[PDB]
Symmetry: D3
Subunit: 159 residues, 6 copies
């Protein structure tokens, strides 16, 4: 736990897109911290507690990953726990631009943390929590987009 | 070559001449066209379902092969329940393109027998959306160029 | 060469140094600058119209020729009535570009006698936005880099 | 519903599975497909016109209704002369989008009776291009994933 | 307010109506306009320097305040040697926007007293560039809509 | 030298944009390898040898950086020397798209290397070797864009 990397998100719910990025980070750091965003406030569809648990179960095959939640600022978290790096994924141009502005502000707020970006794998580049929820609501097959324990909590939620 | 149905889905809240262009450019290529309004979505907007359909029925009068439908669930299931192999959508801008890439990639996982075909917006309609046409009508400016006469009366009346 | 008036529209909720940067790059180019705020947007921000106007006023009193007004109709009509022949907007990013390409296309059809001039944002304010600033303020961090002293004291008041 | 002919233009230097993917998604939609290659482009590729035509020919002989031709004038004129009312192109990325928006704008002014239909590339061929393939081939790596056996043997011949 | 010069730089190889639009929309805002053709650049293209200037001089006859110049070195130094505080450029598409962001950021390091102002291309000219207008003239199609009569003769003649 | 990261480029010539990215990587890996691209063939303006030397001198204040040159494929290099990560910078949307397609192909060619991306600092986001060469040719001031030893080799080259 000399190096620690943080992978932030709402994860509402975690998907195989998220998972890929976490899997492709596990062997490059001593520790991974998947940080879940609190309130904040933003409506639906899984509470904090459920989102954490879903994440915990999709990553239990990965010893160096831990799951936490923060209120404050993502850089304050990183500083709190000794993390020098933040990891995020880029699917698209829109991801890229949104990310440039957030990473700019993060650099001003603390110069000592870097954000490093990985491209989505091509299998997972159209996957959002939003679009998975959309298709789940109409009872479609989601087994290719989300881990099994998440598949269940969606079916459970959407009838 | 066989019987061919193509589906042109959307909110149509309300239909505009930008939408209609894509529909006229598709009639001479399939035997049937289903303009399909995917409501229940609530997630609702400014005209109700029946008025939206009504507005479409009116503006596509001059095209025999165009039916106006509604559907609730998944588009690909609509296509499949009626035997369409083809979804037709328009492209105006880079924002459209990315959003549609994601939708079509998903639609392809769900049912690989449906192809999505894209047409480029004419130059004259590239900037037009339902949204901005409603912003403009809300302040009573001239919308005659953006929508057909019958949609124009309904917007005047809605924002009177 | 007549008396030139330019208008700089926006919601300014709140004004930031990136809006200011644009305003300070516009003062010398025109006889009058009108910073124009949006009224009865029937859409709430963090600060009331009157607050927002007050904050601009103190953030611009150091300049010679800038006046803060509100409008509830169309931009091009405000322009029409005060005799403004130019609108000035700032471009930070590609998403700005496309959003703005559509509005000025519409603004040219509505009134083709107003031009919209765009300037690129300065490198050091590229990433600023009212939103990102309010976000940082809510977590009670140092926003001295991003807004004027008067705006900074009013954001600290807001977010405890 | 007349005899439909569609044209799939390009330089194909060489044809790759991403061009093929588009062609195989077009076979069933039209009576005839014309894969059209660029002649007297007074602009050299890695393979001569005749080589390029040969490689397409072997890469498409498994399909029912696809014919390989060359043209040295305008695309819309080739279309005009063979009675093709449609052009088919593949969209991989945002830079494709913009480049293509300009060409089809021009193609619509030149001849407004031809439509251009675009399809999104499959996820697994999004990143392919003749160039990236020639690059990988020059370093003599496994290109079996990216082009047909016939193209692969001809790229190995090229680059030792 | 003072004496004002604005510079509208470019290749103009050849000038088109897309270029001219940006120039007409700028004449009623500064006292002088210098269309400035930044050649020596070799890196040369299809009309020589004197013919490019010639083509511009002709097409801007109907605007008193427009001078046509040449310059070799840096644009910002040209601006400075003649006392222009303003560079005017057009925007058509997202490719333009990024390229111009980089240029303007550099120009701002080099001389912060020169402002670059951007105008959006009209809808009708959004797809037009010198390049495509030359592609089209090369195959003898109708270019009457893209360039003024005198530029049209020179292109007919160049690609006869 | 348990972890090694490779930072590829033509570096014709190295700039303060490149340097930033190399500086912001030095403390996250045991070793940095700045790899210079050979022929390949592409005209002007500095030969391989000069580009390497310029790089060597701009980074000699950074002990864990080394400078090499490769002919073959970038993934073959990484595999040759035990490097699991490739680092590149993103300035813009155009960088992003060009990069997505290259990183896709790299993943096919070797799944065991990741490319990680950092955003240009805002000071350096309009800087290319091309635009620096352009302005240098007209004798303008470049001291804010390139290191001192590079400033000289440009002035020397462009009179
Ligand atoms: C790079 C990941 C990221 C993501 C987001 C981000 N923050 C939201 O609050 C929503 C949201 N719910 O709307 C959302 O969509 N993205 N916000 C940020 C920061 C951007 C600059 C200001 C400070 C931001 C910051 O740090 N904000 C608190 C925070 C976020 C995430 C986590 Cl894990 C924690 Cl612990 C704190 N960087
Ligand atoms: C991510 C950095 C990068 C950059 C480039 C790249 N390669 C050029 O050859 C030019 C060029 N000169 O045109 C150029 O602009 N970019 N090429 C690649 C690879 C893309 C996919 C095919 C294999 C490529 C590959 O590995 N190609 C050889 C190579 C490049 C760079 C170095 Cl250091 C080495 Cl050692 C080998 N990835
Ligand atoms: N399919 C994916 N592949 C790679 N990265 C992803 C993928 N989906 C999300 N990410 C990234 O993982 C991080 C956490 O994303 P979230 O904020 O949880 O939401 P999201 O699922 O990307 O988008 P929404 O809000 O559902 S539309 C972000 O940096 C995303 O860009
Ligand atoms: N002006 C236009 N030109 C060409 N196609 C369009 C135009 N406007 C809409 N379309 C397309 O017609 C289909 C139905 O669109 P809708 O889902 O009704 O959304 P929209 O009106 O384009 O966007 P908003 O939300 O008002 S900004 C989509 O493929 C649209 O992209
Ligand atoms: N940091 C900036 N630099 C340059 N221009 C800006 C900046 N911020 C806002 N502007 C421009 O000023 C005008 C008014 O913007 P507003 O609508 O008040 O704020 P905004 O850009 O919507 O902020 P958000 O919603 O937080 S992303 C528009 O032309 C903006 O692009
Ligand atoms: N991998 C692909 N997937 C989908 N469409 C493609 C693919 N590659 C090429 N195309 C399309 O097929 C048509 C002909 O392309 P060409 O000009 O032959 O190749 P290209 O796309 O220019 O390749 P380059 O120059 O190496 S990037 C165009 O519509 C391309 O976008
Ligand atoms: N159709 C157009 N509408 C508005 N502005 C344009 C148009 N075409 C060119 N301009 C602008 O006029 C200025 C001079 O452009 P040039 O450097 O001559 O390049 P160009 O002809 O736009 O591009 P190419 O290389 O032919 S694709 C630039 O700011 C251009 O962006
Ligand atoms: N100013 C910069 N800031 C951050 N990264 C950069 C910067 N300039 C270049 N890079 C990156 O460093 C790597 C090496 O770039 P090069 O291929 O050497 O050329 P370049 O200088 O980006 O572009 P050209 O060819 O000069 S237009 C690439 O991944 C670039 O995207």
């Amino acid at each position: 736990e000399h190096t620690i990397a943080v992978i932030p998100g709402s994860f509402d719910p975690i998907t195989y897109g998220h998972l890929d990025i976490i899997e492709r980070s596990t062997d490059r750091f001593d520790e991974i911290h998947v940080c879940v965003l609190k309130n904040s406030k933003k409506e639906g569809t899984f509470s904090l507690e459920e989102r954490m648990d879903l994440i915990e179960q999709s990553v239990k095959h990965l010893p160096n990953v831990k799951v936490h939640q923060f209120s404050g600022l993502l850089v304050d978290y990183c500083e709190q726990v000794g993390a020098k790096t933040i990891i995020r994924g880029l699917r698209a141009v829109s991801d890229f631009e949104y990310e440039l502005r957030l990473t700019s502000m993060n650099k001003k707020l603390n110069n000592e943390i870097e954000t490093l970006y990985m491209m989505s794998s091509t299998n997972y580049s159209f996957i959002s929590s939003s679009i998975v929820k959309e298709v789940a609501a109409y009872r479609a097959d989601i087994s290719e987009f989300v881990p099994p324990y998440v598949e269940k909590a969606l079916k459970k939620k959407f009838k």
